[PDB]
Write a structure and sequence with these properties.
Belongs to the heat shock protein 70 family. By secondary structure, the chain is mainly β. It contains two helices and ten strands; from the N terminus they run E-E-E-E-E-E-E-E-E-E-H-H.
Length: 159
């Protein structure tokens, strides 16, 4: 909670919470000491021609990977709009609640179609020791890997 001015109410979660996608790797739209609650909409696309169905897996932590931070919450979203290879698409929408609880929603938004998981953050209390080692490299070095493992299997896909 980095207070540059006096009356700043900074309810922040210690890590940048993202996802293990396609062949299991990281995408973070969030940040370290993130002022949660937050609804961050990262739009992914597809690898097959006309309608895939995608595997979404949350890993709270790491950079461009399946390294070693908090594995919690994985779901399959399916019912995609049928355009040609790389144009069918899905919004992996991260709706975090104020006690660090991640409501992860994959939306086929041109189709008006979402499925969501509410991940309760108790099986893992990393705190000062794991956050100071991983996310002083990870969130910096992720959007700096250049949407790291965002450019992957197709373009921005999780298949």
């Amino acid at each position: 909670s980095e207070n540059v001015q006096d009356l700043l109410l900074l309810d922040v979660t210690p890590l940048s919470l993202g996802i293990e996608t396609a062949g299991g790797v990281m995408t973070v739209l969030i940040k370290r000491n993130t002022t949660i609650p937050t609804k961050q909409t990262q739009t992914f696309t597809t690898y097959s021609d006309n309608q895939p169905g995608v595997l979404i897996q949350v890993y709270e932590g790491e950079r461009a990977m399946t390294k070693d931070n908090n594995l919690l919450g994985k779901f399959e979203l399916t019912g995609i709009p049928p355009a040609p290879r790389g144009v069918p698409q899905i919004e992996v929408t991260f709706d975090i609640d104020a006690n660090g609880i991640l409501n992860v929603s994959a939306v086929d938004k041109s189709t008006g179609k979402e499925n969501k998981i509410t991940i309760t953050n108790d099986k893992g209390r990393l705190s000062k020791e794991d956050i100071e080692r991983m996310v002083q490299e990870a969130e910096k070095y992720k959007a700096e890997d250049e949407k790291q493992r965002d450019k992957v299997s197709s373009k921005n896909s999780l298949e």
